[PDB]
Write a protein that binds this ligand. Sequence first.
Ligand code: 6H3
Length: 255
Amino acid sequence: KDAWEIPRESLRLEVKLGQGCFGEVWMGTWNGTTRVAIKTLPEAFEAQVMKKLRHEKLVQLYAVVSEEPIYIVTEYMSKGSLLDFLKGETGKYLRLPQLVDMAAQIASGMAYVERMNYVHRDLRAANILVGENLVCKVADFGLARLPIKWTAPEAALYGRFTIKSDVWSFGILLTELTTKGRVPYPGMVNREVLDQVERGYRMPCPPECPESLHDLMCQCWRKEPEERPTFEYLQAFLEDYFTSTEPQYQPGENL
Ligand SMILES: *CCC(=O)Nc1ccccc1Nc1nc(Nc2ccc(N3CCN(C)CC3)cc2)ncc1Cl
């Protein structure tokens, strides 16, 4: 028994939020009044890894109920999933400054994972939560260690899950941001994606996306994992994007 363990009565679930990210999540309340999210259900069912990692851009774990039914108590994000937010009614108004700023926050969370010597293994818009003030935080650490279309080929084929394979997933995530949440590799099935990517195919520049931002994607998609950039580099590049890289960016129809 550790400090994370809490009794089951201390939780007071309220309204259902939906499923996804290894299943059911409820909006509820903790000690009296404390709005939290409760993910309910294999006892391998995400908690042991969130205990060591704490960062402003990672969804923070609050407490765990280790017995069946196993609960996972984390902070509450008001806007929900990033993929839903991009596809939802609010996402249509997002422009490149907001999308790049959201990518910078995600890279900041993964930069913490990077220097902690961890791997996420399932980084994508569906596993990123949005809160107030367009705050984005990384979630989904059920697979975290020390979705073929989002997975680096050396990880999907051989299990070589490194922080550099997360960098590959980040490049795919950039296409989700610049297309308002569209599925990558449109019109391609998983086995076709794996075939063409191994042979060197990469997604083209999304419409209205600047070439400089697409070059960052291709860098994340290099065949050699060691040649992929670090999240420390990705964070600094995206935070300084509209001053150092695209100082003459002009708004368009969608970006
Ligand atoms: C691993 C990432 C993840 O858990 N994603 C996820 C997906 C579906 C439901 C819950 C959930 N987890 C969390 N959600 C919140 N807050 C929140 C979720 C969903 C919504 N709405 C979805 C339905 N409507 C279409 C739009 C809004 C709102 C708020 N907070 C924390 C977690 Cl862990």
